Amino acid sequence: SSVLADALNAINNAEKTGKRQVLIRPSSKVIIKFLQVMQKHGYIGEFEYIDDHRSGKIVVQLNGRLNKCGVISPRFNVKIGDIEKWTANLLPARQFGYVILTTSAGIMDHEEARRKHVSGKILGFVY
Amino acid sequence: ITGKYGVRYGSSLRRQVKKLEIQQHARYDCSFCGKKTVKRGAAGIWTCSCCKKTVAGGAYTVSTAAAATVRSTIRRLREMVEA
Amino acid sequence: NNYKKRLLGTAFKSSPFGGSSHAKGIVLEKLGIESKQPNSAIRKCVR
Amino acid sequence: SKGNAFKHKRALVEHIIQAKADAQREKALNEEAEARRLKNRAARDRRAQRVAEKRDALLKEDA
Amino acid sequence: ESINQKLALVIKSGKYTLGYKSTVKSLRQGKSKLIIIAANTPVLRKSELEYYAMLSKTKVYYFQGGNNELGTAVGKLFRVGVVSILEAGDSDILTTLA
Amino acid sequence: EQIVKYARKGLTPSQIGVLLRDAHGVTQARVITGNKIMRILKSNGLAPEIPEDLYYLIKKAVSVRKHLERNRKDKDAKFRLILIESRIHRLARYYRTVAVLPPNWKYESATASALVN
RNA sequence: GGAUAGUGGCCUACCAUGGUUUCAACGGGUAACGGGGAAUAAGGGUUCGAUUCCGGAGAGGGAGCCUGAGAAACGGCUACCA
RNA sequence: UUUGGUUCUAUUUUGUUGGUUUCUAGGACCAUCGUAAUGAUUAAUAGGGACGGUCGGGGGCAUCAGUAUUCAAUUGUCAGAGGUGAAAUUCUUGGAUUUAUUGAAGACUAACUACUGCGAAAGCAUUUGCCAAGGACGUUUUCAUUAAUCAAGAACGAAAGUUAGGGGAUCGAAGAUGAUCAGAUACCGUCGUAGUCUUAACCAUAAACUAUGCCGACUAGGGAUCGGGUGGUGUUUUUUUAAUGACCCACUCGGCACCUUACGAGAAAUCAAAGUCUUUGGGUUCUGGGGGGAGUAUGGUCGCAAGGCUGAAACUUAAAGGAAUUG
RNA sequence: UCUAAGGGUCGGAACGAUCAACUU
């Protein structure tokens, strides 16, 4: 009934207990894709190794701070006056931040599509 | 309906005389054999063409009434003797 | 979208109305009221 | 009728007329099914027959 | 399944007589194997019905109940009440009785 | 039956491809013609009229109101004849929007007519 | 088809039942002229609009007109009500 | 690629014009032959249905059983039987109060009964049977998106209360009287109307409770009572025996109703959520915005009625209100 | 003074062949 906060709210829902991560939704190009941008900037460990009905692709070890909770979010705007603003979601300007936006092109990160002046949807936000 | 009995005599009465009314006609089963084609010429009487035969029809409804129990009770004692 | 609710309302029509910095008007009667509980005095007012 | 298939006899002649026609046409295009047993079955028996006239080997021997 | 369930297979194979005259023919003619005579169906049209085939050559299992229904039994809905199953089926009309 | 097209699983196997073959198996079997072989026999017959997943809801749901019709006091019978009902309807749609015509069946003599063969 | 400076139910006739609506029709309310923009905004917003500038509409109410390139006119007539 | 499949539109030259039927390809059309992995996401710890096993105080309808209640016919005798704090009102040489056979009537389902089973919810405990249902389990059976929550609209909805008939045991509003009080229209007797039961029809409210919306996630331990797996051991079926069988024990899982203790939540109390998120975040239905004035005024609708449903404003106050802690 | 609507028998969407009238 909503694969996003579904699983990011299990990582989130986990590291607060503290541990070595667990299973999740089913896979999703998108799940796996956030469960990438995450690793690729740090935070999480190694996306994992399942394969079933749609249960396929991965589990995913924890590691590190990653505190706290991946951000799930449930709207979608972007660019210029935007992105910067919804960068108020962030846990503080001075670096730290990361807002896993959805960018017309690419499921990208607050900066990772700040990149080639991109924009669009607001998929989430990490640490 | 009533209104047949036009706006004249009150209500509760109409009501009742409607209850028994719609019931004063159009039965509705074969107390002999066939289909719905009996009734109740007046009271007591109540013959049916799909046999052409008259049944002892109840009152304002040729449906025996309390002879439900009798239906049982009566023929029911017929149980004894001979079971 | 949806949803409008209570509190302060548009319909108005009171007794000075003009939310006036006053209201001119002739001095019908000189009714010195009388204090409420706790305190107590002859509260000189005007109708 | 016993309800109001009418409103002026020109109109029974009407619906009877039209109606009839339109229906006749509905059969007149349900013939399409014929079209679609023919222009397909032809190549069913033609794919079988073409599978025969392109690999007719053990047909002269068998048993 | 029950006879009210056997006659439903019957109406998919066999030879449904459908009658009360054609019932008589069914019999006299000579083919009526069983004979499904409803309770409603008047005495004489039942005792003479009887006599007809109890003369010919057939066993007759007096019906269940309602005639108006004894038809819904054999589909129709038209209150039949004296069938003459004439040909075999996937039913136990040879075991309708013992 | 087709629901019970797989009473085969009982004494044949194996659910059921055969009709394709993926995570296949290990036993005799003579391929697609082993399936089809008696898999066509199956219901001592065939079908398709329309449409099992309802040709059952409408049934249980049909006899389902004989009692309702006579009993009439088992209100704790209406409370379901509504549900087996709202169900029997809820199906239609995914056919009223696909498989069954575009009115009847998808509306059918539903409420009511014991159908239909 | 009639009018229009000219589209068009604009108006005529003839013919057909249509068109809107809970995704809010219709109707009711506005101490309603609209938009510039005004006020207090961390942000998000509340609240305001007839001083100027655009666009509208009216010179007591209400119609109808002559004049003309242009007006249903205010600082022009005509009648009604006032 | 292919007159066979027709069927157009008008261009180019014919000198010019127009009109022609030849082409002549250029659309679209049915055919024909030929090309190519020649066309169908998975089977959601989503949902629907199949199936078979079963469980249950689930639902309807019939019918069984029982004890008592109060009442009778005849009883045995004999001097009080009531009735509370203590009395009284009453019953009573009328045969009560206390027993004696028997039958009569409608309620009602004791005891077992709990740590709870079943139901959407209200609510559901005697017997047997007939009627149609329901979850959980068992498989991957069958489908493949069908779904999730819902203003509208609707089905069921305790008890009283209305309509009409049936009866009418018990208790028992109104109503009487008996005590009691300064005062008793009560609370304590005792009669007793209605009602209590019933069938066809209304009414749609309740502390209608778990005062806690529905769906899915995830977050932590143990015990105990319902279907499925295995070892089976434990004692008996099945008997000359085994085994099996029946209960039954132990380890599991499922889903149930519940209990006992950390992180984390809260104003507290407490909470297995009332948990997660700085202070979004998974989707939705709903209701709240100081007390009163009030669930009143008016309007429209529903109803037979009682009432239900919808539902204000004027004015009026600064506290009312939760939890906790002490007197 | 005009316009329009609304029917019966015989022969194949037929025509009218023919017949007769109220009334809106």
PDB file of all heavy atoms in Angstrom, chain G residues 23-33:
ATOM      1  P     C G  23     -18.371  15.133  -7.014  1.00  0.00           P
ATOM      2  OP1   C G  23     -18.954  14.314  -8.097  1.00  0.00           O
ATOM      3  OP2   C G  23     -17.960  14.461  -5.762  1.00  0.00           O
ATOM      4  O5'   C G  23     -17.170  16.018  -7.606  1.00  0.00           O
ATOM      5  C5'   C G  23     -16.771  17.240  -6.976  1.00  0.00           C
ATOM      6  C4'   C G  23     -16.608  18.365  -7.967  1.00  0.00           C
ATOM      7  O4'   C G  23     -15.412  18.134  -8.734  1.00  0.00           O
ATOM      8  C3'   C G  23     -17.755  18.501  -8.956  1.00  0.00           C
ATOM      9  O3'   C G  23     -18.268  19.838  -8.999  1.00  0.00           O
ATOM     10  C2'   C G  23     -17.177  18.098 -10.303  1.00  0.00           C
ATOM     11  O2'   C G  23     -17.595  18.902 -11.378  1.00  0.00           O
ATOM     12  C1'   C G  23     -15.680  18.189 -10.111  1.00  0.00           C
ATOM     13  N1    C G  23     -14.994  17.079 -10.739  1.00  0.00           N
ATOM     14  C2    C G  23     -14.319  17.367 -11.907  1.00  0.00           C
ATOM     15  O2    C G  23     -14.333  18.556 -12.259  1.00  0.00           O
ATOM     16  N3    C G  23     -13.680  16.377 -12.581  1.00  0.00           N
ATOM     17  C4    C G  23     -13.734  15.131 -12.113  1.00  0.00           C
ATOM     18  N4    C G  23     -13.088  14.189 -12.807  1.00  0.00           N
ATOM     19  C5    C G  23     -14.459  14.809 -10.920  1.00  0.00           C
ATOM     20  C6    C G  23     -15.088  15.803 -10.268  1.00  0.00           C
ATOM     21  P     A G  24     -17.323  21.140  -9.114  1.00  0.00           P
ATOM     22  OP1   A G  24     -16.620  21.063 -10.425  1.00  0.00           O
ATOM     23  OP2   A G  24     -16.502  21.220  -7.856  1.00  0.00           O
ATOM     24  O5'   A G  24     -18.420  22.316  -9.140  1.00  0.00           O
ATOM     25  C5'   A G  24     -19.611  22.177  -9.925  1.00  0.00           C
ATOM     26  C4'   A G  24     -20.867  22.431  -9.130  1.00  0.00           C
ATOM     27  O4'   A G  24     -21.137  21.297  -8.260  1.00  0.00           O
ATOM     28  C3'   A G  24     -20.837  23.664  -8.230  1.00  0.00           C
ATOM     29  O3'   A G  24     -22.127  24.272  -8.214  1.00  0.00           O
ATOM     30  C2'   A G  24     -20.570  23.056  -6.867  1.00  0.00           C
ATOM     31  O2'   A G  24     -20.985  23.851  -5.779  1.00  0.00           O
ATOM     32  C1'   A G  24     -21.376  21.775  -6.965  1.00  0.00           C
ATOM     33  N9    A G  24     -20.988  20.761  -5.996  1.00  0.00           N
ATOM     34  C8    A G  24     -19.810  20.082  -5.871  1.00  0.00           C
ATOM     35  N7    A G  24     -19.788  19.259  -4.849  1.00  0.00           N
ATOM     36  C5    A G  24     -21.025  19.442  -4.247  1.00  0.00           C
ATOM     37  C6    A G  24     -21.630  18.873  -3.112  1.00  0.00           C
ATOM     38  N6    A G  24     -21.032  17.960  -2.340  1.00  0.00           N
ATOM     39  N1    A G  24     -22.882  19.273  -2.786  1.00  0.00           N
ATOM     40  C2    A G  24     -23.476  20.188  -3.553  1.00  0.00           C
ATOM     41  N3    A G  24     -23.003  20.793  -4.639  1.00  0.00           N
ATOM     42  C4    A G  24     -21.765  20.372  -4.938  1.00  0.00           C
ATOM     43  P     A G  25     -22.332  25.826  -8.631  1.00  0.00           P
ATOM     44  OP1   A G  25     -21.006  26.375  -9.000  1.00  0.00           O
ATOM     45  OP2   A G  25     -23.084  26.485  -7.527  1.00  0.00           O
ATOM     46  O5'   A G  25     -23.261  25.694  -9.931  1.00  0.00           O
ATOM     47  C5'   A G  25     -22.729  25.205 -11.157  1.00  0.00           C
ATOM     48  C4'   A G  25     -23.784  24.572 -12.048  1.00  0.00           C
ATOM     49  O4'   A G  25     -24.172  23.273 -11.525  1.00  0.00           O
ATOM     50  C3'   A G  25     -25.104  25.309 -12.181  1.00  0.00           C
ATOM     51  O3'   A G  25     -25.064  26.382 -13.084  1.00  0.00           O
ATOM     52  C2'   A G  25     -26.013  24.198 -12.606  1.00  0.00           C
ATOM     53  O2'   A G  25     -25.655  23.763 -13.898  1.00  0.00           O
ATOM     54  C1'   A G  25     -25.568  23.145 -11.615  1.00  0.00           C
ATOM     55  N9    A G  25     -26.116  23.444 -10.280  1.00  0.00           N
ATOM     56  C8    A G  25     -25.462  24.046  -9.242  1.00  0.00           C
ATOM     57  N7    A G  25     -26.202  24.224  -8.179  1.00  0.00           N
ATOM     58  C5    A G  25     -27.433  23.734  -8.544  1.00  0.00           C
ATOM     59  C6    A G  25     -28.651  23.630  -7.875  1.00  0.00           C
ATOM     60  N6    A G  25     -28.880  24.023  -6.645  1.00  0.00           N
ATOM     61  N1    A G  25     -29.690  23.094  -8.484  1.00  0.00           N
ATOM     62  C2    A G  25     -29.487  22.688  -9.730  1.00  0.00           C
ATOM     63  N3    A G  25     -28.397  22.722 -10.490  1.00  0.00           N
ATOM     64  C4    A G  25     -27.390  23.266  -9.826  1.00  0.00           C
ATOM     65  P     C G  26     -25.104  27.883 -12.514  1.00  0.00           P
ATOM     66  OP1   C G  26     -24.574  28.770 -13.575  1.00  0.00           O
ATOM     67  OP2   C G  26     -24.423  27.874 -11.199  1.00  0.00           O
ATOM     68  O5'   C G  26     -26.653  28.139 -12.306  1.00  0.00           O
ATOM     69  C5'   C G  26     -27.606  27.369 -13.003  1.00  0.00           C
ATOM     70  C4'   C G  26     -28.921  27.350 -12.284  1.00  0.00           C
ATOM     71  O4'   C G  26     -28.979  26.193 -11.419  1.00  0.00           O
ATOM     72  C3'   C G  26     -29.186  28.513 -11.340  1.00  0.00           C
ATOM     73  O3'   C G  26     -29.592  29.695 -11.989  1.00  0.00           O
ATOM     74  C2'   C G  26     -30.236  27.936 -10.426  1.00  0.00           C
ATOM     75  O2'   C G  26     -31.483  27.857 -11.093  1.00  0.00           O
ATOM     76  C1'   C G  26     -29.678  26.527 -10.239  1.00  0.00           C
ATOM     77  N1    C G  26     -28.737  26.515  -9.137  1.00  0.00           N
ATOM     78  C2    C G  26     -29.325  26.540  -7.894  1.00  0.00           C
ATOM     79  O2    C G  26     -30.565  26.477  -7.833  1.00  0.00           O
ATOM     80  N3    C G  26     -28.527  26.604  -6.811  1.00  0.00           N
ATOM     81  C4    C G  26     -27.211  26.665  -6.961  1.00  0.00           C
ATOM     82  N4    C G  26     -26.479  26.719  -5.851  1.00  0.00           N
ATOM     83  C5    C G  26     -26.601  26.686  -8.246  1.00  0.00           C
ATOM     84  C6    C G  26     -27.396  26.620  -9.313  1.00  0.00           C
ATOM     85  P     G G  27     -29.138  31.116 -11.398  1.00  0.00           P
ATOM     86  OP1   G G  27     -29.636  32.157 -12.333  1.00  0.00           O
ATOM     87  OP2   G G  27     -27.670  31.039 -11.129  1.00  0.00           O
ATOM     88  O5'   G G  27     -29.939  31.188 -10.024  1.00  0.00           O
ATOM     89  C5'   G G  27     -31.305  30.841  -9.962  1.00  0.00           C
ATOM     90  C4'   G G  27     -31.737  30.597  -8.548  1.00  0.00           C
ATOM     91  O4'   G G  27     -31.128  29.387  -8.046  1.00  0.00           O
ATOM     92  C3'   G G  27     -31.317  31.634  -7.533  1.00  0.00           C
ATOM     93  O3'   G G  27     -32.095  32.799  -7.574  1.00  0.00           O
ATOM     94  C2'   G G  27     -31.472  30.870  -6.254  1.00  0.00           C
ATOM     95  O2'   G G  27     -32.845  30.674  -5.980  1.00  0.00           O
ATOM     96  C1'   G G  27     -30.874  29.539  -6.666  1.00  0.00           C
ATOM     97  N9    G G  27     -29.425  29.546  -6.460  1.00  0.00           N
ATOM     98  C8    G G  27     -28.420  29.509  -7.382  1.00  0.00           C
ATOM     99  N7    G G  27     -27.230  29.569  -6.844  1.00  0.00           N
ATOM    100  C5    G G  27     -27.486  29.666  -5.498  1.00  0.00           C
ATOM    101  C6    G G  27     -26.606  29.778  -4.423  1.00  0.00           C
ATOM    102  O6    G G  27     -25.380  29.800  -4.429  1.00  0.00           O
ATOM    103  N1    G G  27     -27.288  29.834  -3.228  1.00  0.00           N
ATOM    104  C2    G G  27     -28.643  29.836  -3.074  1.00  0.00           C
ATOM    105  N2    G G  27     -29.107  29.929  -1.816  1.00  0.00           N
ATOM    106  N3    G G  27     -29.480  29.741  -4.082  1.00  0.00           N
ATOM    107  C4    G G  27     -28.827  29.663  -5.246  1.00  0.00           C
ATOM    108  P     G G  28     -31.418  34.209  -7.222  1.00  0.00           P
ATOM    109  OP1   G G  28     -32.477  35.260  -7.366  1.00  0.00           O
ATOM    110  OP2   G G  28     -30.186  34.311  -8.046  1.00  0.00           O
ATOM    111  O5'   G G  28     -31.016  34.042  -5.686  1.00  0.00           O
ATOM    112  C5'   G G  28     -31.884  34.478  -4.650  1.00  0.00           C
ATOM    113  C4'   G G  28     -31.406  34.041  -3.277  1.00  0.00           C
ATOM    114  O4'   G G  28     -30.724  32.759  -3.348  1.00  0.00           O
ATOM    115  C3'   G G  28     -30.389  34.927  -2.615  1.00  0.00           C
ATOM    116  O3'   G G  28     -30.941  36.092  -2.094  1.00  0.00           O
ATOM    117  C2'   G G  28     -29.802  34.008  -1.576  1.00  0.00           C
ATOM    118  O2'   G G  28     -30.731  33.791  -0.536  1.00  0.00           O
ATOM    119  C1'   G G  28     -29.681  32.730  -2.394  1.00  0.00           C
ATOM    120  N9    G G  28     -28.415  32.710  -3.124  1.00  0.00           N
ATOM    121  C8    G G  28     -28.210  32.651  -4.478  1.00  0.00           C
ATOM    122  N7    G G  28     -26.950  32.712  -4.806  1.00  0.00           N
ATOM    123  C5    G G  28     -26.315  32.834  -3.584  1.00  0.00           C
ATOM    124  C6    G G  28     -24.955  32.935  -3.282  1.00  0.00           C
ATOM    125  O6    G G  28     -24.034  32.949  -4.087  1.00  0.00           O
ATOM    126  N1    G G  28     -24.728  33.041  -1.922  1.00  0.00           N
ATOM    127  C2    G G  28     -25.693  33.036  -0.978  1.00  0.00           C
ATOM    128  N2    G G  28     -25.277  33.145   0.277  1.00  0.00           N
ATOM    129  N3    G G  28     -26.978  32.944  -1.237  1.00  0.00           N
ATOM    130  C4    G G  28     -27.202  32.845  -2.549  1.00  0.00           C
ATOM    131  P     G G  29     -30.389  37.486  -2.617  1.00  0.00           P
ATOM    132  OP1   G G  29     -31.357  38.527  -2.205  1.00  0.00           O
ATOM    133  OP2   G G  29     -30.095  37.320  -4.062  1.00  0.00           O
ATOM    134  O5'   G G  29     -29.036  37.644  -1.786  1.00  0.00           O
ATOM    135  C5'   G G  29     -29.073  38.091  -0.440  1.00  0.00           C
ATOM    136  C4'   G G  29     -27.813  37.750   0.302  1.00  0.00           C
ATOM    137  O4'   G G  29     -27.314  36.476  -0.144  1.00  0.00           O
ATOM    138  C3'   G G  29     -26.645  38.691   0.104  1.00  0.00           C
ATOM    139  O3'   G G  29     -26.744  39.849   0.905  1.00  0.00           O
ATOM    140  C2'   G G  29     -25.449  37.818   0.460  1.00  0.00           C
ATOM    141  O2'   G G  29     -25.240  37.795   1.860  1.00  0.00           O
ATOM    142  C1'   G G  29     -25.915  36.432   0.009  1.00  0.00           C
ATOM    143  N9    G G  29     -25.319  36.064  -1.274  1.00  0.00           N
ATOM    144  C8    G G  29     -25.936  35.655  -2.421  1.00  0.00           C
ATOM    145  N7    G G  29     -25.083  35.458  -3.378  1.00  0.00           N
ATOM    146  C5    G G  29     -23.852  35.760  -2.812  1.00  0.00           C
ATOM    147  C6    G G  29     -22.559  35.770  -3.367  1.00  0.00           C
ATOM    148  O6    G G  29     -22.225  35.439  -4.503  1.00  0.00           O
ATOM    149  N1    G G  29     -21.594  36.135  -2.444  1.00  0.00           N
ATOM    150  C2    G G  29     -21.849  36.515  -1.158  1.00  0.00           C
ATOM    151  N2    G G  29     -20.783  36.827  -0.413  1.00  0.00           N
ATOM    152  N3    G G  29     -23.049  36.525  -0.623  1.00  0.00           N
ATOM    153  C4    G G  29     -23.984  36.135  -1.509  1.00  0.00           C
ATOM    154  P     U G  30     -27.068  41.276   0.243  1.00  0.00           P
ATOM    155  OP1   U G  30     -27.605  42.151   1.332  1.00  0.00           O
ATOM    156  OP2   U G  30     -27.902  41.023  -0.958  1.00  0.00           O
ATOM    157  O5'   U G  30     -25.635  41.794  -0.196  1.00  0.00           O
ATOM    158  C5'   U G  30     -24.812  42.490   0.722  1.00  0.00           C
ATOM    159  C4'   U G  30     -23.365  42.146   0.531  1.00  0.00           C
ATOM    160  O4'   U G  30     -23.242  40.736   0.231  1.00  0.00           O
ATOM    161  C3'   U G  30     -22.670  42.831  -0.626  1.00  0.00           C
ATOM    162  O3'   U G  30     -22.235  44.128  -0.308  1.00  0.00           O
ATOM    163  C2'   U G  30     -21.523  41.893  -0.908  1.00  0.00           C
ATOM    164  O2'   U G  30     -20.491  42.095   0.045  1.00  0.00           O
ATOM    165  C1'   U G  30     -22.162  40.531  -0.637  1.00  0.00           C
ATOM    166  N1    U G  30     -22.662  39.858  -1.865  1.00  0.00           N
ATOM    167  C2    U G  30     -22.043  39.829  -3.118  1.00  0.00           C
ATOM    168  O2    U G  30     -21.026  40.374  -3.460  1.00  0.00           O
ATOM    169  N3    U G  30     -22.654  39.121  -4.081  1.00  0.00           N
ATOM    170  C4    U G  30     -23.807  38.436  -3.931  1.00  0.00           C
ATOM    171  O4    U G  30     -24.256  37.844  -4.900  1.00  0.00           O
ATOM    172  C5    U G  30     -24.391  38.494  -2.636  1.00  0.00           C
ATOM    173  C6    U G  30     -23.806  39.169  -1.667  1.00  0.00           C
ATOM    174  P     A G  31     -23.129  45.084   0.607  1.00  0.00           P
ATOM    175  OP1   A G  31     -22.959  44.643   2.005  1.00  0.00           O
ATOM    176  OP2   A G  31     -24.489  45.094   0.025  1.00  0.00           O
ATOM    177  O5'   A G  31     -22.437  46.503   0.396  1.00  0.00           O
ATOM    178  C5'   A G  31     -22.628  47.560   1.327  1.00  0.00           C
ATOM    179  C4'   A G  31     -21.458  47.673   2.273  1.00  0.00           C
ATOM    180  O4'   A G  31     -21.935  48.071   3.584  1.00  0.00           O
ATOM    181  C3'   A G  31     -20.682  46.383   2.502  1.00  0.00           C
ATOM    182  O3'   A G  31     -19.617  46.228   1.585  1.00  0.00           O
ATOM    183  C2'   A G  31     -20.223  46.489   3.944  1.00  0.00           C
ATOM    184  O2'   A G  31     -19.062  47.293   4.025  1.00  0.00           O
ATOM    185  C1'   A G  31     -21.381  47.250   4.579  1.00  0.00           C
ATOM    186  N9    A G  31     -22.455  46.358   5.069  1.00  0.00           N
ATOM    187  C8    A G  31     -23.543  46.751   5.813  1.00  0.00           C
ATOM    188  N7    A G  31     -24.385  45.791   6.092  1.00  0.00           N
ATOM    189  C5    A G  31     -23.828  44.679   5.474  1.00  0.00           C
ATOM    190  C6    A G  31     -24.237  43.330   5.394  1.00  0.00           C
ATOM    191  N6    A G  31     -25.346  42.827   5.950  1.00  0.00           N
ATOM    192  N1    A G  31     -23.451  42.480   4.707  1.00  0.00           N
ATOM    193  C2    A G  31     -22.337  42.960   4.143  1.00  0.00           C
ATOM    194  N3    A G  31     -21.848  44.196   4.146  1.00  0.00           N
ATOM    195  C4    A G  31     -22.647  45.020   4.833  1.00  0.00           C
ATOM    196  P     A G  32     -18.809  44.846   1.511  1.00  0.00           P
ATOM    197  OP1   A G  32     -19.796  43.758   1.695  1.00  0.00           O
ATOM    198  OP2   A G  32     -17.678  44.948   2.462  1.00  0.00           O
ATOM    199  O5'   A G  32     -18.263  44.833   0.014  1.00  0.00           O
ATOM    200  C5'   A G  32     -19.159  44.770  -1.091  1.00  0.00           C
ATOM    201  C4'   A G  32     -18.424  44.588  -2.401  1.00  0.00           C
ATOM    202  O4'   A G  32     -18.715  43.284  -2.950  1.00  0.00           O
ATOM    203  C3'   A G  32     -18.792  45.552  -3.520  1.00  0.00           C
ATOM    204  O3'   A G  32     -18.134  46.802  -3.401  1.00  0.00           O
ATOM    205  C2'   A G  32     -18.402  44.781  -4.772  1.00  0.00           C
ATOM    206  O2'   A G  32     -17.024  44.933  -5.039  1.00  0.00           O
ATOM    207  C1'   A G  32     -18.650  43.333  -4.352  1.00  0.00           C
ATOM    208  N9    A G  32     -19.897  42.788  -4.912  1.00  0.00           N
ATOM    209  C8    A G  32     -21.206  42.899  -4.528  1.00  0.00           C
ATOM    210  N7    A G  32     -22.027  42.234  -5.308  1.00  0.00           N
ATOM    211  C5    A G  32     -21.202  41.656  -6.258  1.00  0.00           C
ATOM    212  C6    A G  32     -21.436  40.837  -7.370  1.00  0.00           C
ATOM    213  N6    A G  32     -22.638  40.409  -7.757  1.00  0.00           N
ATOM    214  N1    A G  32     -20.369  40.452  -8.095  1.00  0.00           N
ATOM    215  C2    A G  32     -19.155  40.868  -7.722  1.00  0.00           C
ATOM    216  N3    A G  32     -18.808  41.635  -6.698  1.00  0.00           N
ATOM    217  C4    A G  32     -19.895  41.994  -6.011  1.00  0.00           C
ATOM    218  P     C G  33     -18.859  48.150  -3.882  1.00  0.00           P
ATOM    219  OP1   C G  33     -18.488  49.223  -2.899  1.00  0.00           O
ATOM    220  OP2   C G  33     -20.301  47.826  -4.087  1.00  0.00           O
ATOM    221  O5'   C G  33     -18.173  48.429  -5.294  1.00  0.00           O
ATOM    222  C5'   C G  33     -16.863  47.961  -5.581  1.00  0.00           C
ATOM    223  C4'   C G  33     -16.825  47.173  -6.868  1.00  0.00           C
ATOM    224  O4'   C G  33     -17.150  48.027  -7.983  1.00  0.00           O
ATOM    225  C3'   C G  33     -15.481  46.577  -7.245  1.00  0.00           C
ATOM    226  O3'   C G  33     -15.215  45.372  -6.562  1.00  0.00           O
ATOM    227  C2'   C G  33     -15.584  46.402  -8.756  1.00  0.00           C
ATOM    228  O2'   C G  33     -16.220  45.171  -9.080  1.00  0.00           O
ATOM    229  C1'   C G  33     -16.512  47.554  -9.148  1.00  0.00           C
ATOM    230  N1    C G  33     -15.800  48.671  -9.786  1.00  0.00           N
ATOM    231  C2    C G  33     -15.889  48.734 -11.170  1.00  0.00           C
ATOM    232  O2    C G  33     -16.520  47.847 -11.773  1.00  0.00           O
ATOM    233  N3    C G  33     -15.277  49.748 -11.814  1.00  0.00           N
ATOM    234  C4    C G  33     -14.616  50.686 -11.135  1.00  0.00           C
ATOM    235  N4    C G  33     -14.038  51.672 -11.837  1.00  0.00           N
ATOM    236  C5    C G  33     -14.525  50.647  -9.713  1.00  0.00           C
ATOM    237  C6    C G  33     -15.135  49.632  -9.083  1.00  0.00           C
TER     238        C G  33
END
